Structure formats: C-alpha cells, structure tokens
Symmetry: D2
Subunit: 262 residues, 4 copies
Amino acid sequence: KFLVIAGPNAIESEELLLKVGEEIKRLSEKFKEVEFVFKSSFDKANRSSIHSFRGHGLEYGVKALRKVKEEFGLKITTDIHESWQAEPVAEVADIIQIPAFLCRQTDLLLAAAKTGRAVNVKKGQFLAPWDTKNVVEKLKFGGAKEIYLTERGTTFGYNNLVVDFRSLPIMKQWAKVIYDATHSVQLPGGLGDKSGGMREFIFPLIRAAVAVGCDGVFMETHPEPEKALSDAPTALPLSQLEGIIEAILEIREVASKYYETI
Amino acid sequence: KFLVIAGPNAIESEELLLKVGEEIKRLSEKFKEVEFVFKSSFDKANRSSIHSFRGHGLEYGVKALRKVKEEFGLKITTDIHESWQAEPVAEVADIIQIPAFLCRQTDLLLAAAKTGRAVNVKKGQFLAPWDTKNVVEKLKFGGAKEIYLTERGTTFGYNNLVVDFRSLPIMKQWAKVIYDATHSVQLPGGLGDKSGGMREFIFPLIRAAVAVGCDGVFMETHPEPEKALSDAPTALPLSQLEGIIEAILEIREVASKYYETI
Amino acid sequence: KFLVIAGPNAIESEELLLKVGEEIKRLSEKFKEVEFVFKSSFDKANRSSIHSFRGHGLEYGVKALRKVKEEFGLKITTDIHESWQAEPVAEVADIIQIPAFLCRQTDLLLAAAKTGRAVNVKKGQFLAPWDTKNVVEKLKFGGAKEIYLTERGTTFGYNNLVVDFRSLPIMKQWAKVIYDATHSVQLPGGLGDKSGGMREFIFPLIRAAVAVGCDGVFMETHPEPEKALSDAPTALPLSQLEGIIEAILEIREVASKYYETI
Amino acid sequence: KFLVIAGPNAIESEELLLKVGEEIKRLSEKFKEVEFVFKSSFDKANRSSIHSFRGHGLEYGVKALRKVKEEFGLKITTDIHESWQAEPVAEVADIIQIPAFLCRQTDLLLAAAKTGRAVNVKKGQFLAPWDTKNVVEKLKFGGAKEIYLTERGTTFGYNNLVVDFRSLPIMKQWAKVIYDATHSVQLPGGLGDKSGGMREFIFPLIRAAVAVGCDGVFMETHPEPEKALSDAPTALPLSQLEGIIEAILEIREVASKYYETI
C-alpha cells in the first residue's frame, strides 16, 4: 500500500510528538489503505547556524518515539548522522533515514543496513537520478532488504532547489521511491542563518509526484508551523493534513492506470 | 475548456500536415470538451547546424496550414522569427507563437500583438517564472487580448533542461499557461549537430502538469517520429495521442477541484 | 595585438559617445600594443520592460557611431537584431555583434556574414561551449573570415550567471575568444523589470580571463555608471579603464607563456 | 606566504607517500617562500561504488603520514569523516580537512576545532559562497583559530561542476581561501561506478584562481595518475608539479598588485 511519512520535523518535545501522533493515528484509522509512519528527528545535526535549535539528544528522542509507537501503535522513522547511532536508534525506528548530505557516506549506510531495519535514503542535492543505483547497491551489500530513495530536490543555482520529476521513474528501477514534499520546496540558507521555503508550492508538487508515480509521500507537519523550531516556513499545518491525504489517494487512483512498468 | 496544441514539428510537406490533421480532426470530434489547435512551423530558424532542415518557405507554409484549416476546420498556430512575418502569418494563424530564444525581443512581441491574433510565448530557457510578467505587459502594450505562456523547460547544466513545475502557478497569475510536453524533455545540442531528448519522460511529465494545473498542453507528433526532419527524438507516435489525451482529461477531472485560486 | 572592446552600453546621445570616445582615444594613444574597438548599441531590443530605454533608432546611431570613427579614428562595433539591419550597420561597423539570445538565428548570422565585416557572436546563456562550433560553421558558410565568440556567462539557477572559464580554451579551437567582463557579472531581471549586477566582481574575473587565455576583453564604461540608461549596475567608471587595461597587459605578459597551444 | 597543499589522493602504499613526499620536499627546498603541506586521505569514505578503493584504516594512515612528517619534515593534512576521528588524527595532522559533503555537519566541525589544530573545510557542492560565513562561525565557536575554506566546484546540472570564481573574494571576507585545482574539474559519477574529470582544465583554472586571488592551492598528484586507485582522471602528474608551482608564483607576483582589499 501507499506510504505516508508524517510528523514534526524535530522532536521539540514528546508532548508535541504525542499531539501530532494523535492526528496521524486518527488518519491511520480513516485511511486503512495507507501505511502511515510517524517521523521526527531527535537532532538537526546540520543546521546552518550554530545558534539554531538542534534537539534534546538521542536518549530523549528515542524515548519520545517509543511513547508515540507504544501509545498510538504507529511505525516510526528517524534519521541518524553517525555510524554509532544506527544500533541504538534501530531499537525504535522501523525505518532508518539517511540524511541527504550523507547519502554517500558508506559507513553510515552499512551501519543502518546491519540493524536489519528498513533504510530510506534522502537523495543528495548534488546527486543525479542514475547515481542512486550505487547507493542501493551499498545497502544491499550491507544486508538491507527494504530500501527507499527519497526525492527532495536538486541544487539549482544558489539557495534554490528544483524537483526534476524524471527522477521518480528513473530511481524506481532499483528501489521504492518516496517524494519529500516539504524539503523539496525549501530554499537552502535562504534566510541567512536559516533555510526558508515556499509553502504555497507543497501541495501542487505533491499532486505532481503522485500523477507521475511514487510509492509514497513524505511531509512534515506541525500545529503552528510559525512556531516550529526547525523549518518553520515549510511545516504543514495538522488541520490540512487530512485534506491533502484524500487528494493524493484520489489522484493516485486515476493515474495508477497510467504508471509505466517499473 | 482545455487546450491541446498538437501537430508535426515542421511543415515537411502539405501531405504530412493533412495526415496529422485528419487525426487531430478525429480527436476534436471524439473529445468535444477539448479545444484543439493544429501546430506546425513553416521554418526552423534556430537549428544548431547550417545543414539541418529548415522548411519550404513562409508562402508554402501558410498555404499548407490554410489547407488544414479549410479541410478540417481546425484552429491554427505557427511561430514567427522576425517582425515582418507576423502580418502574413496572421492571415491563417489563430495563435501566433513566439520562439523561446526570442521571448525577449520587443519588436517581435509587438508585431505579433498588432495583428489582433492571440499570442503564445515559449518561455526562454534562461527566464525565471516571475520574469514572464514583463513579457505579458509588453504584449498587452502591443494590443494583445488573448495571451499564453508556455513552459518548455529551463537550462540545467549543459545540454539538459529541467521542468520546475513551480512555474505553472506562478505564470498563471498573469496569463493562461501551456505545458510543452515535447521540448521540455529535449536535450539541447545533445546529438552534436542536432538536439536530443527522452520520449519515455513525455507522458509522465504531462501527468505532472495537469495534476499541478495548467490551461493546456502542447504536444508535437508524427506518423513516423524516427523520420521527422526536426526534433525526431521527441515526436510522439501519432497513434499514441488519443490515450494521452484521455489520461489528461481523467487526471484533470479529479485534480481540478484542488487547483489553488490565483 | 590584444583586443579591448569598450564604450557605453547604449547610444544615449552623441555627446555621451564623444565623451567616452575621447577617453578611448587617449587610451589608444597610451596603449599602442592594443587594438581598441568602440562599442555602443543603437537599440536595446531585448529589455525586460516595455518601459525601459531602447534608443534613438538605427539611423541616428549609425551616424553617432560614424562621428566617433571620424573624430577619433576608432574602429566600431555594434549589434543587430534582425537580418535587414546588417547592411546599413555594416556601413560603419568594423565588427558586427550578434546578441546572446540570437546566437542561433541562422538568418541573422548569415546576414552579418554577408557584409564582409568581422562578426562577434555573444555566446547564449543557454549554450554549451562545444555547441559554438556550429555557430562558427554557419558564419564561415556565409562568407565570414574574422570570427569572434564572446563569453558572457551561462544560466545558473534563476536571475544569476556563472562564468565557466573552461569555455575559453574550448571555443578557442574554432574562433578568437572575447571575455565580456560587464555582462558576465550582471544578474538577469534581478531588480524586477531591470537586470542587476555586481561591479566588485568585474575586475577579478577579467584577471581570471586573461590568466586562462583569451584574445580580448569587452567592457562597458560610462562617465556616471549609476545614471546609465541601460545596464546601470555594471558600467565601469571611465577613470577606471586605464588601471584595468594596464593590469590585463601585465598579467597577459606573464601568463601568455603558459597558454596551451591549439 | 602562499600555501600549497599537495599529495596523492589516498594512502595507496607507503612507497607512494614516500615518492611524492620526496618530491614535495625537494620542491619545498626550491621554493622557500611557499608553505607546503602534505595531504592524503587515509580513507575514501564516500566513493560511489562499494567496490572502489577506500584505504587501509585510520591506524595505517596516521602511521604512514607520521612517516612522511618525520622523514621529510613536512606539515600534514588529511580529512576526517566522523567525530571520533578528530582526536586521533590530530596527533599527526597540522590541518584537519572537513569533506565537502560534510561541511554542514556541526559535530564534525566542532570536533576538529576542539583539537586545537588548524581546520580546512571543503565548500559543499551545494553551498553558496555566502553560506560559508556560518561555517566559520561554528569553527570559531568551537575554538578554531586558523580556519581555511576551499573552493572545489559547485553542482552544475548532473555529473558536472563549475567554478564560480566570485566565491574567492566572497569567502576571503571571513577566512583564508584555498583553491582545489583537482576536484574542481572532476565530473561527479561521470563514469557510472566512478567519477570522471578533465585534466586539461587543471592548469588553466589554476592560473585563474591565482589571478583572482587566493591564499593557496590544493593539488592532488601521483607518479602515474592513470594507475591511481582514486580520482585517477584528475590527479596531476608528479613531474608537472614543479612547472605548475613556478607558473603560479610568477602569476601571483604580478596579479597580487591588483587584489582588492577585504
């Protein structure tokens, strides 16, 4: 079934995770045909400014994710930044996510693929579609079986990303494909010491992703994006989450008939 | 009323135009909810090589297009390359097309608008979406009342183009928007003394366009794409047009309600 | 001898031309080992806005340029935008300049080549260095003997240009190469209905161009840059020309030894 | 005191570091006004293919490097990929190198800075010149005193990089700037399983860098580049290292009297 990865960008507090996990859970019950996964980073190890919010550490984070997984019975996914976090994080994460900038760090991929968990690699802003093939080969070598590749934009000039949708069918040749609807529209370092974004384009490109054909969508949400401690201009409101989900399912029903073979 | 602009890239002969027109006429009768416009260039004025096919002249081209209009009752569109061509072309063209490399040539835009005919400007590979606002302003200054802006890709590195679908909603603010499904996947000068392309991406990107939201699609076609005298690697088999059109209408039907208001 | 093409961007008035020509003449007398060419456009046919300054017509311009040539004995270059302008322009222009957006327009190149004059083609912002071979081929076919290709930046994301200095040795294989120091640092439609620019990068990049190896430098100048009716954010103050020319001659002198052959 | 960072791409064999360190030593004796620093990676932690050469371990590397430093009395630099490697590597490395893909990894930067050693950050292929200011701020916050920023190209379309020389004067505002002459001409994933490159542009782009103005150059060398275990198509022949160094010194001597003031 279609995959939908949602949740706040960062674990600002397990209280937030629970509030969001609540809505996701509800949606999990309304759309039984969709496989939901709660997502949230315990640490923003790559902020532009040393002064920006990062998180409360792996311990706190893993705990919060457990709470959500136990209280709502939802699958969990979070990203690791160094080889040593794979094993410990793999205790709660159903899917281990590999950060975009780190999509080529061999040891990080192997460590994630040794936990037996599923691994979702964010396609680097510097990588070409056909280049993700080796990324999958590394994971396969590392013992991974459930592998995902996530489209999240490509470097287009300075402080700007463009989504080359030709990547969806190209990467589908060797791995399940996910489209990152929130980071694809962000503007790297667009705010001096922060990365801005253009929310007005999140939904439109999501509709495009589904029409083209992907195995799932990735989208970060938050009660009040304006108050988000990370990626505020790209965080999608919780109240809009349901409507958008209904849209992708409808579009997916009509378009699936036309998706090309692998 | 969705617009479908289709036809052979160039006027290889009056015979080729009548063969493609017969099909477009069939399609116009089958899909009465779609507005069809037959397209074909009387001159490829911007070929990479001095040895490539250009055409049989304006007089011959205008005559061939009038035959199509008279015989099948179809609307006509063709592109101009120098100001003096606007008037004679207007005798038969319902829509005057302005080439991508020339989207900033003031006199050409003005001459086209002065004819009283609708004008469709191919957005230059060097132009940002917001830069098209001045393009529309020039046309209105020139007296144009019906104006279109066509997305046909942007320069991405050498010999490659990317389609930034954020441009559709942006350009929709000042004019009707068309998606050029054939040129958007072409590879500029990719074949040495000629250009290339990737036909496999044509359909999927078209699905993206209608899902995002546009007022029409531009698709070039040929009975035998392989033998086309220009843009061969991009011409769509004439028999595949029907299925494509059906798909766009189905996708547009479900996606239309999600179209964000400008 | 090294080529220095300089002058005010547009023929704002003959007073302006004469004031600039006076300094170029003085520079001509001081730097005998340099071939200076006075440049000025009789019409800005590609402005972003219908409201921007274009010029006072071809006739006024050819006369203003003839005045410069007669009063100062300087060679002349100016650009044409449509085929019919080549002949009248050739009456005074020693070098006919072909605009960047129009570098692929066969008829414009052929018309320029037909005059017997030298032809300088600005490399399109959408063109790859290797694709300029075909441009030279058209010109030669049309009878041109003295051919120049000018580097003026390539599209890099929106509203930005980057200079790929790899283009200098590549294009040198088939033509003499000129480095456009002013337009290479401009920012396409940066200030809305006008192009921006960063004058602080003009000199540094000119140094790079001569170190890599080229046959000349194209640089615009104005008595009061900020008051220029065209390309304001890029013209160099007249008083700065001397210092810059000295530097290029000195850098060239030491680097020429290392220029790669053929 | 111009800085020259040269050496083999990776620690392939002791005999390699010796044959190169020997030449680098001889050169350091010939050009006393230049500060040479021996460089070589003890591990290629981000190769495209899991089947490509990586190294012989951190131990074998730190050891082989100390051999170079003790035997030839040459400063050393190598890059780290994970936090923990900071402390151990710093016991031999005068300058800790931060990989291009990792220039945003806060903890990695903070770790190299705590060691007290000098830090050189390769600018990410996805980073804009002005984005480096936050990088320097992080390092200073971590205790770094001697900080370098290295230009190594920017993503330009797929499988290609371009060097935007405007970056040199831009990064010089907050740190010393180094120009990576070898990786800047490499073609990412250009050969599918491995990256490509165009060695013919190495020298010319080096001349540009010094003409523009930088504090040093980074050059990878090998006795027989074609036989290199990594970056074979970009490594510079060892025997050419001398001619190149002389050339940049001559160009620097003349161009330096024109460097702008930061």
